[PDB]
Amino acid sequence: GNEFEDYCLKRELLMGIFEMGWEKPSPIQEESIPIALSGRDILARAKNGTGKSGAYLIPLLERLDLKKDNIQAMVIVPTRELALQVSQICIQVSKHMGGAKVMATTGGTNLRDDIMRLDDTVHVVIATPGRILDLIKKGVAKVDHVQMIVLDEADKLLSQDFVQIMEDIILTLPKNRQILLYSATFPLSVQKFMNSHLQKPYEINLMEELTLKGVTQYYAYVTERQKVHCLNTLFSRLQINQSIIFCNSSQRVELLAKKISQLGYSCFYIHAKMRQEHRNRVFHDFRNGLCRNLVCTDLFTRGIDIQAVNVVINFDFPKLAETYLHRIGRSGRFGHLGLAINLITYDDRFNLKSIEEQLGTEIKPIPSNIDKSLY
């Protein structure tokens, strides 16, 4: 089996642990511990039942260099209720660590006494956003030495109430700070934060969930009459194995399918106004590479789990972001450098940017010369 000692931790820490009753690591600990000690950022799905407290404290305490009096680690939580819960544990785990100062400051603890307390050495901070940001901006909390930060129940930390706070706090930190994210759900805000800040994050319990991981995204300013020409060029310039095209209606799907089959290109097509046994047959055939290009509406409900698809095109641009994500994204099981292109009209601009921001990613205009290595 697998044991704590295998991770190579400090004696004082292992004892501190053992004294808690933690004889063997839980799966989440087994997942996150050895990854965190390697420096890799973490994006993890886990229930609000902590649980995950021990998962990110152990590696956090281990990274500490106690010969340094600066703050080196932080842990952000939504409620004051949880700050105590985590802090108490962190203390009880680090009891044999010599001079490990843990500070737990929320909007429920007296501000003044905490302003005071911070004039002394503190390594680990455990705070709610509103308070910690307050402490940082005043200058009391010296954070230019942090090497690790933890978002516990980030779904709540990234809500509209706390999102900007949380955003500002990172700006104060080093550009290379290790971030460990733990959340119960995985809405789009978490996706913003992921794509905005985290760097090559090891994913825990995120199979069967969509991300733009590996995907290069572009956008062209083109009108309805001009679209087909742009597409024609794209078929003529891009190095495509298999592609997929999306349109906003079965009508246009057909109309387009006939239009591109006229220019000397080969394609199949499917839509909602078909029969199940039919679409399954066409898709099955397209899966076996009996054609290069597929035309379709939003059908699958799944991620596009086809390896050979190296280009996705939004002939018609969507309104909702989740839709875009469903078309573009992959399920974490399939990570290939696929390409994504968005033919965009005037009616679509405010949706190009609103989506760009909503997923917290960057959609750059098309270069005449697209790096083949990119896909």
From Swiss-Prot:
Q: Where does ATP bind?
A: A46, K47, N48, G49, T50, G51, K52, S53
Question: Which molecular function term from Gene Ontology is one that the record holds?
Answer: mRNA binding
Q: Where does motif DEAD box map?
A: 152-155
Q: Where is this region: Gyf binding?
A: 192-222
The Enzyme Commission number assigned here is 3.6.4.13
Q: Which residues form the Helicase ATP-binding domain?
A: 33-204
GO BP: miRNA-mediated gene silencing by inhibition of translation; negative regulation of neuron differentiation; negative regulation of translation; neuron differentiation; P-body assembly; spermatid differentiation; stem cell population maintenance; stress granule assembly
Family as reported in the entry's similarity comment? Belongs to the DEAD box helicase family. DDX6/DHH1 subfamily.
Q: Disease linkage in the record?
A: Intellectual developmental disorder with impaired language and dysmorphic facies: An autosomal dominant disorder characterized by intellectual disability, developmental delay, impaired language development, and dysmorphic features including telecanthus, epicanthus, arched eyebrows and low-set ears. Additional features include feeding difficulties, mild cardiac or genitourinary defects, and distal skeletal anomalies.
Protein name from the UniProt record: Probable ATP-dependent RNA helicase DDX6
Gene it is expressed from: DDX6
Whole-protein coverage range: 95 to 469 of 483
